[PDB]
Subunit: 157 residues, 6 copies
């Protein structure tokens, strides 16, 4: 089997992330979305909620599974019997840092990182900015999956 891991904090998952999941699922036999949480309580959604949002947003991808990650991403990737990470590039991505992490990840565990450009319509959403705008009252519903929109609306109502 070919396979890739798509790691992130997904707090919450965006349509930018889902686009990347779809591309990974199209090109690898199996995809694992690895939810890697904050070292210190700082998130908007708890882990259970993050998991549910990813699952509910990926029902159309039968070769994708969702799991909570622990420790070094490369250790999680190798625990999945894989050697590839797939990550998206968007507007605002710190690409130099992504490159540094990719080189470090290859050095320590031989894990490759494949980068893919997110679809233009979803290229300016990030979890952080979506939350920031949502919390100040703005509408980002067109940039997030409906399972995320539902939960966001509940927190503000």
């Amino acid at each position: 089997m070919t396979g890739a891991v798509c790691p992130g904090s997904f707090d919450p998952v965006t349509l930018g992330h889902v686009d990347i999941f779809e591309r990974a699922a199209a090109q690898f036999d199996e995809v694992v979305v690895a939810i890697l949480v904050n070292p210190a309580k700082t998130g908007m959604f708890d882990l259970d909620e993050r998991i549910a949002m990813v699952k509910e947003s990926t029902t159309h991808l039968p070769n994708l599974r969702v799991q909570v990650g622990h420790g070094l991403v490369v250790d999680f990737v190798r625990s999945c019997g894989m050697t590839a990470i797939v990550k998206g590039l968007r507007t605002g991505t710190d690409f130099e840092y992504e490159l540094q992490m990719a080189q470090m990840n290859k050095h320590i565990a031989g894990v490759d990182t494949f980068f893919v450009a997110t679809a233009p319509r979803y290229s300016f959403v990030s979890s952080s900015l979506a939350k920031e705008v949502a919390m100040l009252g703005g509408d980002v519903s067109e940039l997030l999956p409906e399972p995320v929109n539902r939960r966001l609306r509940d927190r503000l109502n």
Copy 2:
């Protein structure tokens, strides 16, 4: 009327900012400098002081006014009856993040962002770096308006 908003925390306003104010005032019928403060108390100058410093530094621009901003910048821009933001680019600007915010701002409110390169002599000052250097004893008086220099000198004397 044509018009633009120049948003920032201006803590304190620099000659880099003033350069941008001048360019905006030269090209739009009206300019509003929007002072948008920290979500959490972290600034050097209080809001009243920031306002005074901007006003005192822009007496030569009769079509410019200064107001405190609240909430999403785009909501403030639209409250001013405008649809444009003017921002400066300098050495050290995270341009990828500026682009992300501009695209998000256009998405949520149809507000355009126009970027302009700050004058070379003022292209390496930032509020943060100016404060950092000032607090460690260095001289940045040539990079800040005199109304700011006066107040800075008072805090150290």
Copy 3:
């Protein structure tokens, strides 16, 4: 009157360019599209055709006019009684070179350059790449105005 010039070779004009024209026309009282041609015969469309394509693509912008430019862009801008250039940023833009030209243009003639991020859907088209793909048989009709599509199809039929 406020006013801006939108300079380019427009060979041919793209929907990326038209997006920028629209933003300029929304924020300035008058816009002049300045068609500045090759120093040496190298273009796909002659000047007459470039002019027609821009005009036919901008009939919805009553405060926009199209003229052929000559010499330094800044000299043309000043001949229009203006002091501002508006240019788009897209994926693939050499932003460092754009900044260099903007600083040079300000130095020699006091002309300001305002940069605006092109709409995501039109952020990866360029005249060159559109021609390259079109000539190799690919479909970029969704990235160009219909007046350009008509003429392109004629050259290949």
Copy 4:
């Protein structure tokens, strides 16, 4: 089958390219190296020589094949029954242009592009720079496959 195409002019193939071939072959069931030549005679090695150099440099990759490409890369990719391109990133890569081409390629044919960072030791070689240095008398043998070194040495002896 999963599969990826690795397109390039490979004039000549470098160890940077071979590194990318190896990563693609590790993660996809099949890899096709597509040699896409100059629209106008400008190369150092003819097509037959380029093909031989790639083949001789990839004997250790049994799931990799080499073919000459024609027309749009995306048309070649789809002719291979694939929907993915794998490309390397190195020091000196114009990443903005790579992104533009990737977005265009996805737009016109639905083909995804996966980018991977080349190994540090091979991150500063390019075909052009290798030729430039080789022609001026410098030693780049540690940056090129032996099948390429042999042929290079023959051209200078």
Copy 5:
């Protein structure tokens, strides 16, 4: 005497840093490594330990000395009777910010900054990332001097 200062927090010193020390020592008569610590207790190693690690890692450079820095780096540089800073560039370096600091440092004290590209094999290590990986259990021993490896291993055993 010609001379340069190599400033940093060195928490801990990496082989990337040592590479830069070596290049500085090769090109200047004297080199001073200036250890500039956190304004607030946040480091892994105390100052005494940082000093020892640098000294033990540079025994092969007889024209290099190690000192603790205080205040503005430029003030320290001038206190050493020098007017040059040498800094490394690696993968992940925020080069725009480095440029801003260099321009500010030249403005306030006339101190020049010379940047040098770190050796490829050491181009993806940083003190922060090395600690992050080390603390999560990963092996970065090939990226750090043995005097640092010894101390790291002691903290985890």
Copy 6:
């Protein structure tokens, strides 16, 4: 002796280049400006004129000498008994390509490259852009040494 080479085509030398010469001469015992000309006749000024312009512009730097370079820059550097190149960074510099060349130069000859940020006032001039503007009638006299201005004015009169 410490020493550095400052290589370039200098067609013509700009005040940006002279700024870099001055910084090199301040930090190294000896500086050699190496004029490396076009592989094919394409320049505005012949080699004799380029040499004269550099010499006449550097009379205030007694530890600087001017020589015509041949072949690989690293071979010229080593022929000068040196192992360092000093190059400027300005607005518009392709820094990724500079890094690639620096890494290649270190690989083939062990020669280090030190980069320094050009003074802001001279950060947007380049030989090419200066010629382009000069030829179209614009005034760049404030960006070039008087010995260059004299010769430029002669070509247009």
